Amino acid sequence: MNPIILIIILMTVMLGTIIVMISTHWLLIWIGFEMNMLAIIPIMMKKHNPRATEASTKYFLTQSTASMLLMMAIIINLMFSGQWTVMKLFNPMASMLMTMALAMKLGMAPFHFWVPEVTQGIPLSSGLILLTWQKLAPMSVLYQILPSINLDLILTLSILSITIGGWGGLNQTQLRKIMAYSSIAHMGWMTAVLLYNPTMTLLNLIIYIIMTSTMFTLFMANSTTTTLSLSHTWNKAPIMTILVLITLLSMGGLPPLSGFMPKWMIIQEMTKNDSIILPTLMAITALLNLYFYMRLTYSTALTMFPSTNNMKMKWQFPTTKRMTLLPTMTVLSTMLLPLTPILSILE
Amino acid sequence: MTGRQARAPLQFLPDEARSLPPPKLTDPRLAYIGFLGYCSGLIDNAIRRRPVLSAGLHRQFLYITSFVFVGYYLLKRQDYMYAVRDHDMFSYIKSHPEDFPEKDKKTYREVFEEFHPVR
Amino acid sequence: AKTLLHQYWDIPEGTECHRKTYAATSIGGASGLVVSAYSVALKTPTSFLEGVARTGRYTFTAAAIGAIFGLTSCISAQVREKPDDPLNYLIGGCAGGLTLGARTRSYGIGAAACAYMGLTAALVKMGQLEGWKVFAEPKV
Amino acid sequence: KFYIQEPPHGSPNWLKVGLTLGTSAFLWIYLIKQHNEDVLEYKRRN
Amino acid sequence: PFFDVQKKLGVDLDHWMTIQSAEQPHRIPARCHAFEKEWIECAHGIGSIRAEK
Amino acid sequence: VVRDHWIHVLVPVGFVFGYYLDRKNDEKLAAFRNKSLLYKRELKPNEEVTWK
Amino acid sequence: LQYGPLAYILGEKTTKKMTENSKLITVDGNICSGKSKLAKEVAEKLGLKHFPEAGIHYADSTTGDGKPLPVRFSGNCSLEKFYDDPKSNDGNSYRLQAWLYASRLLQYADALEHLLSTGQGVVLERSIYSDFVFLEAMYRQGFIRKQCVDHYNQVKKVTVCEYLPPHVVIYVDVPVSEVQSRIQKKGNPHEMKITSAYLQDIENVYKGTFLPEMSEKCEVLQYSAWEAEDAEKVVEDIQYLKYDKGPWLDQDDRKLHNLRMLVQDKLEVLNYTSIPVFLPEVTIGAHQSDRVFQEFTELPGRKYRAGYNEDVGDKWIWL
Amino acid sequence: IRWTCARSANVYPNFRPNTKTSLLGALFGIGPLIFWYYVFKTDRDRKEKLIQEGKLDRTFNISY
Amino acid sequence: MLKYIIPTMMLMPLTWLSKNSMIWINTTLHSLLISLTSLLLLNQFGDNSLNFSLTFFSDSLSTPLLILTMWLLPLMLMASQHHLSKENLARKKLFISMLILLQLFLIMTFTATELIFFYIMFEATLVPTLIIITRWGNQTERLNAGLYFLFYTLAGSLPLLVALIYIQNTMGSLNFLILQYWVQPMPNSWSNTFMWLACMMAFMVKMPLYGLHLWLPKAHVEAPIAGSMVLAAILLKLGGYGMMRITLLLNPITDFMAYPFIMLSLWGMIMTSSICLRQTDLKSLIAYSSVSHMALVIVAILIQTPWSYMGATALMIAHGLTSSMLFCLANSNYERVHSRTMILARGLQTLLPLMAAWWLLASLTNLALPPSINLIGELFVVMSTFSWSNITIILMGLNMVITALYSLYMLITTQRGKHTHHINNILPSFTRENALMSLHMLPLLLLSLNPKIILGPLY
Amino acid sequence: RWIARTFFDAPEKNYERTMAILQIESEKAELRLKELEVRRLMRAKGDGPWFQYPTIDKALIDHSPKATPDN
Amino acid sequence: PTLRWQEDPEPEDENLYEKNPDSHGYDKDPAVDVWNMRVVFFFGFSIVLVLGSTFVAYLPDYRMQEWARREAERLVKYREAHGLPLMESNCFDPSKIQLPED
Amino acid sequence: LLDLIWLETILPKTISLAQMKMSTTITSQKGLIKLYFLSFLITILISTTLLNFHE
Amino acid sequence: MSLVYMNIMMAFTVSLTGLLMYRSHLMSSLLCLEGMMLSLFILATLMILNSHFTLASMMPIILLVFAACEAALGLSLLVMVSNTYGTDYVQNLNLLQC
């Protein structure tokens, strides 16, 4: 590697997602997905272990077959009414394959088998960029193609994604698998609204991206990957404890805190239809996926685990890390309760 | 609610946003954003081991200024969007007046209801 | 699946008895095929014969649930003869849960199965009686 | 001066802090300018 | 979203690959050219659901 | 003389500030002044007010 | 700071401060014999800077103010107590040894930092490698449970499989009776209460394991006791050497950049210290840890980033 | 301390649900509940049907 | 009321930028000043409540509870020393600021305009008490207690939000004034039954009722004194307040579906009075006492007489004061001996002579002291429920007998009979404990003089 | 009378404030019900300016002399 | 051979007295103890309790109570002066009602 | 017999043990690849032919 | 529906199942992915040639050159997998267990 080479490759990730955003054509969208894949491979395997090698293998196979299934759906769309415009499709079967391909692309619960396995054995920068941009890219396409989708697919993937992202993690102690299960749950929440009012989906996308950036930045405050390392972060610095506390509780979704705002407004514009069984199921599982958050909190923020010396040795040294933009994103991502009428900023 | 005349691309502050009263000094929402900026700079000094409430005073001033600037433009776009929602609503009222009849506003001298005695 | 659940709701409640049990056995066999397909495709039971054994056992238990549920549905509808209550199907779902606990040979776990399957059957009959739109409106 | 021969920083510069104060004054003058122009625009129209 | 740098800069960098019935280089037609011209002239200022209706 | 303790002065200043803001809010909500149907009189006796 | 990616692009290289002065030479020998004598000798002769033996309070002696903190903070090693009773049910060997491991890693990080930062090459002594030799011999004397030895071995698996080996190792051999005579010359009774079978096991494992695990990586120059000062002969056969083995011919710019940006941010070096397996000699209760951290904040110098801390300076909190 | 910790916290282990314990629980919890529920059924049906007849003792019955 | 919210925002950084040995007096003094400032509140008159803004309006149900909250704050803020004097200055500031933030969300909760704002501030009340009891629980299962607390209160209080959005998009706006004017009977469907069960079940969980009260004993035996008193008094009576406001709608079906909650409330009140008769761990006796009195409150809510509502709010305020006092008595006993049990610390008539006056007075207030507010509440609830049914007076009087019984046994187990003559480490009676008791009980007797304040809006 | 003179507020003041806020939120409830009616009927019909998903723009559709005389 | 710990004998019993016999309830700084006693027994009782007592002892009556007394006296004297019985029932005008018939 | 042990078995224990068992059955998939793609296959087939989405 | 499209899509589905189920290696899986690529190429090529879709005839060549470099990436990844082991089995990938 070189820093210039990384400038170029991250520039191409930016360019690929922008080409996904910007074109009215299908080929450029598929090229954007492919360039996203090709450029996001070398961000993984930034170190040199076979863990990242197998993770990159799993990611490449699932990512590739999702792109190929998408291209199949587009060519079926031109087997029916023939144009390369990004609008309503003209086949239940092509839309069926397209939603399944995008579901493998981002990760739903039938297709979520690769996400924790790829997010464990990688460095944290690779995981952050894959989570943010790989959940940012297909939602643009779904926002554009929404009026041709049978609701059974999006509804089933959303319900199943929320419940499997809830039920996974309760045995899990690796923090990357915890955050990946949280990603599955929030993508289910981001999916279950799209046939009703997509403004909520893109708003939940913005909120989840800012929360994930704050989360992985406070995991990059020092080299930590397990909970016992977070107990050592307790005994080495007090401010990291309360910041991890507040960001975890905003991922939990509690009303005086900013992460409740995507939940409740989704419940509102859900229930202006006659959907009641779906909000109560989704919200009971949103109660369920708070327990692993809460046991992480109970572990390393409010109880006081016994620590190990050479933290005495670590006390002499300043935190000379770099933060990309930590405090701005943190207090913007936590105290954002009374700015709920910034819903309409999204048009 | 979809665009609604994207002809006229995304356009972060449109032309008709100057055809409506902008927000003013000491409005409470921008004051909230300013306190959020003060807390932002304070917690930025709280990240590193530099002392709180000191030695970041230019960072205090810069963060507060930047957040007030951003939030001011966001408030302008917000009021534009609510105003254009209002105009679209009343214009659809004007387009189909026949579909929305005036309901039978009876006075309560002639309204029969049920009583359901609790005891 | 869709056409045979529509067959089940086409059978009135009402008394067109044991065709209800035929449809409920078909529903239970379909659901057992689903869960057995997951359990054989996510395990590698080593070997193929044991996989066929696990699939047949799962489909047999789920068809037993549907069979005994439809039987006591018909029994409530013919003996007590209140056609539009959630109470009879609360009893029915409890019967299905207790027979599931019998086929898995667990007693308190069978009582929990009684409670939850009875409440779900009461929800299904109750919302279908009042009329609650499944999955969507999907209008606004 | 009290350290083991290692000042990393702490003795302040005069480029970064002056640049930040200048750009924040720039942003205050620009926002007051924009707000006065928009008040004048609303007075022009109505 | 559906961003429109496409319209803000106003460059037809994508509006030629899009449908049939555009300006083919040697001016040759497709098989169903007039049908697309009539269907698009049916569906220009049309709100995408009454397009179906 | 005030700088001996600038700490204890703070909360009555906060209360007076909130009270002034509530009076300004009530001035913002100054509709139906004499338009009520029970507590109704003219602009009388002194000068043009019934509550302020 | 003049580091990071932008400083690496705008700056010339990390390679043009080479060579033949920038090198890692390491004098390695027994306790009380192979010591700072020949290290300071070759530092004055070859024109090449010098680090002392890694002290217990070396972390205090390398940052903050030069005055070392008392052993409530830098301890609880008590090397004099280890020479008194190295079979403590109170726990004295392994806590001391993990602290000295962190000290060895800190001074080796200082060595590689000074090597990559412009030069000009350093001599080291009593390295990390002699530290695992110390643990192996100390377990041969039966002082530590084997699980705790497995823990130190896991720390060695993590931290040592990361960095570059030194260039050369100047090995000193001094026999057991001669170290006994030199420790009688040294005459510290706390140090004189050491035994000799422990020293014998040190030299046995220190020849039988350290030297084959060199295998001409870290080219060894093996000397006798009177084969010392003799400074001309050691600079002569340092001039003889040719630097074949080791990855020092294969870095060439990227990995030197990686170690430049990895050795600085010392907390990124030292995050891998507490694994933890919880080591019943080593852990600390919560109340003791809290009061020790509060008393650490109750020093003047070590009280939240002294470059910004008042009462010593630095006259600028920007009014 | 042993008696207190056994009396409060060391109850929930050890537990096994026996049929005799379960039947005794459902009798000591639901029996009197459905008993008083039947008598509130009885008294409320009598009183409400009596006042639906209108023949209450409501000569003056203000403090309801 | 905004002039009551904004000095609480000003009271938070007081704690931060006051120095060592200077935070304490400033916080205590200024919160007592706020107690004066909202003692100035009671302007409420006649036809309506005192209603100022799109933001604020206050009933005379909300008035005594809000005065009680702001009065209970500085008493507590003095009460919570001696267990964090040895802790850090920064952790002490975090503790006190967390208390102030909790008060702020309590006032926000009591003066809510629409019930959405009430729900937001309801779970905003929920969140910091967790942090208080978990960071200073001082017993090994504060883990389990906080976990039970948050999961029960969320997962019971979760469908309430859905039902409120449903009432939003079926009947216009959710302000309590127009909902008072735009109520209409929603008859016996099944969806009406589910919606009523959702709202009432959420506040049932907040009370708690007998069905899932199990979080409440652990949350009082495994909590510090400040979170315990806030929890018991303000949170449980806040749940009662919320049920009082939401029960205005959904009148026609409560005769159909209000029977079993009455049943579980009455029989669980009797069983709770039975189970607190025998247990050790003195701190828990007040918690089961609270369960009994709030079961009585719930019976008082679900019968729908103005007599019943006035007795309900009287019992609310009276048990809030009594239970907070008795918590502080148990905290004094736990400062004397490090036991928390019931049979260990005995004697205490010889030692601490005027402490006996406060134990006697507290057991009197549990005992329905004959002009006290507690007896007023219990008496009018018995009146309204004997109007509701002529046979339920048996359970009420059996509750009365056992209530007197366990209150008296709580007295004479600790402070009667023999000093154990091996303890020998009790300090004499501090002026702090007696000061806190004079702060508790003089307002209770003043309200016992002229109780026309504490009766509710149906006065 | 001193309390009523320097501390409290007039019942006319409170009464008219209640009247004004009831007027405000009555208009808000009317507009909200009108909003949901407009949204559901506009999604049902499609005439209004809101739910217009982007169809084809006929800038590239051109009339010209082609090659094949049947077009 | 093992104890798994390194801390003090924790805790330690700490009597607050026997360093200031004239101390009030809280900590060992003796002057601010008297400051705290002064501030709580003046700004909790001498200016809060008795002033709130005299505030609640008389204030303008809730529910316009004495107003309701005098209004009821006036209206009952009115109705007994005009011969008709006090509390005429049917509180709304039965001529001004529109009953939906059967 | 009523409050402590039986109420703590009926409300927390059944829910908590149910969620614990569903966790130990779902997340305890050993890390193969063929299993995941066969899960993809049975998902595609059970979406097409059992409960159809195109029809 | 131009019945060559029928068995082309059928063989596409069989190629997709070949990509999904595989028991020994990974190069065979990548080869079936290449066959699926060929299927997409052929179907789009026959359609654009049928429709006289002369203006946007870029689709099959650009589709295959892009999915070609995709396959190249897959080859480099499988070489790295086979180089950190002796083989390229589906087995000996079960580490990083779940």
Which residue, G113, G106, G283, is CA-closest to A316? G106
The 3-state secondary structure of chain A reads: CCHHHHHHHHHHHHHHHHHHHHCCCCHHHHHHHHHHHHHHCCCCCCCCCHHHHHHHHHHHHHHHHHHHHHHHHHHHHHHCCCCCCCCCCCCHHHHHHHHHHHHHHHCCCCCHHHHHHHHHCCCHHHHHHHHHHHHHHHHHHHHHHHHHCCHHHHHHHHHHHHHHHHHCCCCCCCHHHHHHHHHHHHHHHHHCCCCCCHHHHHHHHHHHHHHHHHHHHHHCCCCCCCHHHHHHHHHHCCHHHHHHHHHHHHHHCCCCCCCHHHHHHHHHHHHCCCCCHHHHHHHHHHHHCCHHHHHHHHHHHHCCCCEECCHHHHCCCCCCCCCCCHHHHHHHHHCCCCCHHHCHHHC
Sheet strands (E) in I140-191: none
Tokens 């910790």, residue?
H5
Handedness of CA L40, L43, L49, L52 (dihedral sign): negative
- Partner J contacted by A87 (CB < 8 A): yes
User: Which range marks the domain in which residue I321 is found?
Assistant: 1-459
Nearest to L51 among C2, C37, C38 (CB): C2
Q: Which chains touch L (3 or more CB pairs under 8 A)?
A: A, C, H, I, M
- Does residue I443 contact residue I71 with C-beta atoms inside 8 Å? yes
Per-residue DSSP letters for I20-48? Answer: TTTHHHHHHHHHHHHHHHHHTT----TTS
Our CA-based measurement puts residue K11 at a distance from the nearest CA of chain G, in whole angstroms, of 9
| Integer Cα distance of I444 and A31 in angstroms | 76
Query: Does an interface of 3+ CB pairs under 8 Å exist between K and H?
Result: no
Angle between helices A124-145 and A27-40 (to 10 degrees): 170
**Token code pair at residue I292:** 């009994």
Handedness of CA M5, M6, M11, M15 (dihedral sign): positive
Cβ contacts of J29 on chain I, cutoff 8 Å: 172-173, 178
Number of domains forming the structure of chain M: 1
**In terms of C-beta density within 10 A (0-12 exposed, 13-18 middle, 19 or more buried), how is residue I241 classed?**
buried
Handedness of CA H20, H22, H25, H30 (dihedral sign): negative
- Does residue G280 contact residue G133 with C-beta atoms inside 8 Å? no
Tokens 């789920």, residue?
C62
| Integer Cα distance of M66 and A33 in angstroms | 11
| Integer Cα distance of I214 and L4 in angstroms | 7
Measured CA distances, A231 to A248, D11, G213, G286, I334 (Å): 15, 35, 37, 11, 31
User: B28-31 contacts: CB < 8 A, separation 24 or more?
Assistant: B29/A338, B29/A339, B29/B71, B29/B75, B30/B68, B30/B71, B30/B72, B30/B75
Nearest to A272 among I134, I147, I169 (CB): I169
Query: Does an interface of 3+ CB pairs under 8 Å exist between C and D?
Result: no
- Does residue I16 contact residue I93 with C-beta atoms inside 8 Å? yes
Cβ contacts of I43 on chain F, cutoff 8 Å: none
| Integer Cα distance of F24 and F30 in angstroms | 10
Question: Cβ atoms within 10 A of the Cβ of L46, count?
Answer: 16
| Integer Cα distance of I149 and K4 in angstroms | 33
| Integer Cα distance of G203 and I246 in angstroms | 84
Cβ contacts of D1 on chain G, cutoff 8 Å: 313
| Within-domain flag for M79 | yes
| Integer Cα distance of I234 and I105 in angstroms | 11
Q: Provide φ and ψ at G221, rounded to 5°.
A: -125, 105
Q: A85–J56: do the CB atoms touch at under 8 Å?
A: yes
**In terms of C-beta density within 10 A (0-12 exposed, 13-18 middle, 19 or more buried), how is residue C128 classed?**
middle
Q: Provide φ and ψ at G50, rounded to 5°.
A: -135, 135
In B58-117, the residues whose Cβ lies within 8 Å of chain D are 58-59, 61-62, 65-66, 68-69, 72
Nearest Cα residue in chain J from A197: J51
| Within-domain flag for M95 | no
Q: Provide φ and ψ at H59, rounded to 5°.
A: -50, -45
- Contacts for I235 with CB less than 8 Å, ≥ 6 apart: I125, I129, I206
Our CA-based measurement puts residue C136 at a distance from the nearest CA of chain L, in whole angstroms, of 15
Our CA-based measurement puts residue K8 at a distance from the nearest CA of chain G, in whole angstroms, of 7
Query: Does an interface of 3+ CB pairs under 8 Å exist between M and H?
Result: no
**Token code pair at residue C28:** 């239970």
Cβ contacts of I148 on chain L, cutoff 8 Å: 12
**Token code pair at residue I2:** 């905004």
Measured CA distances, I328 to G27, I435, L13 (Å): 69, 11, 34
- Partner C contacted by J48 (CB < 8 A): no
| Radius of gyration of chain B, Cα coordinates, nearest whole angstrom | 25
N-to-C CA span, chain A = 41
Nearest Cα residue in chain B from H52: B117
Measured CA distances, C72 to B75, C32, C96, I239, I452 (Å): 63, 21, 9, 43, 61
| Integer Cα distance of A102 and A96 in angstroms | 10
Per-residue DSSP letters for I284-321? Answer: HHHHHHHHHHHHHHHHHHHS--HHHHHHHHHHHHHHHH
Number of domains forming the structure of chain A: 1
**Token code pair at residue K49:** 């309790």
Which SS3 state, helix, strand or coil, does residue G223 take? Answer: strand
Measure CA I304 to chain center: 22
| Integer Cα distance of A285 and A280 in angstroms | 9
Beta pairing class for A307-308 and G283-284: antiparallel
Measured CA distances, G249 to A57, A226, A341, G15, J68 (Å): 32, 37, 62, 12, 72
**Token code pair at residue A304:** 């006081």
Nearest to G274 among A3, A232, A319 (CB): A232
**In terms of C-beta density within 10 A (0-12 exposed, 13-18 middle, 19 or more buried), how is residue L1 classed?**
exposed
Cβ contacts of A38 on chain M, cutoff 8 Å: 69-70, 73
Q: E22–M58: do the CB atoms touch at under 8 Å?
A: no
- Supply the DSSP symbol for I236: I
Q: Provide φ and ψ at A200, rounded to 5°.
A: -65, -35
Q: What is the CATH number of the domain that holds M45?
A: 1.10.287.3510
Tokens 């009012």, residue?
A197
| Integer Cα distance of C109 and I194 in angstroms | 27
Q: J15–F36: do the CB atoms touch at under 8 Å?
A: yes
Cβ contacts of A316 on chain G, cutoff 8 Å: 59-60, 63-64, 302
Resolution (A): 4.1
Tokens 């109570």, residue?
K65
In G33-92, the residues whose Cβ lies within 8 Å of chain K are 76, 89, 91
**Token code pair at residue I453:** 């304040």
Per-residue DSSP letters for G168-206? Answer: EEEEE---HHHHHHHHHHH--HHHHT--SHHHHHHHHHH
I88-116 b/e (C-beta count within 10 Å ≥ 16 → b): beeebbbbbbbbbbbbbbbbbbbbbbbbb
Q: I254–B116: do the CB atoms touch at under 8 Å?
A: no
Nearest Cα residue in chain J from K55: J3
Measure CA C119 to chain center: 12
- Partner L contacted by H29 (CB < 8 A): yes
Q: Which stretch of DSSP H or E encloses residue G24?
A: strand G24-28
| Within-domain flag for M75 | yes
Q: Which stretch of DSSP H or E encloses residue G125?
A: strand G122-125
Beta-carbon contacts below 8 Å between A and M: 78
Domain map of chain K by residue range?
17-102
Q: Which stretch of DSSP H or E encloses residue G221?
A: strand G219-223
| Integer Cα distance of B94 and B88 in angstroms | 10
Experimental approach: cryo-EM
| Integer Cα distance of K51 and G271 in angstroms | 61
Measured CA distances, G135 to G101, G132, G156, G171 (Å): 10, 5, 11, 19
Nearest Cα residue in chain B from J57: B7
Per-residue DSSP letters for I140-154? Answer: TTHHHHHHHHHHHHH
Please give the torsion angle defined by the CA atoms of residues G253, G256, G261 and G267, in that order, rounded to the nearest 10 degrees. Answer: 160
Cβ contacts of A279 on chain I, cutoff 8 Å: 162
Angle between helices G93-116 and G146-159 (to 10 degrees): 10
Q: Provide φ and ψ at L18, rounded to 5°.
A: -65, -45
- Does residue K39 contact residue I28 with C-beta atoms inside 8 Å? yes
**Token code pair at residue J30:** 């009317």
Domain map of chain B by residue range?
1-96
- Does residue A73 contact residue A93 with C-beta atoms inside 8 Å? no
Sheet with G168-172, side-by-side order of all strands: G49-50, G122-125, G24-28, G168-172, G219-223
Cβ contacts of A117 on chain M, cutoff 8 Å: 96, 98
User: Which range marks the domain in which residue M41 is found?
Assistant: 1-86
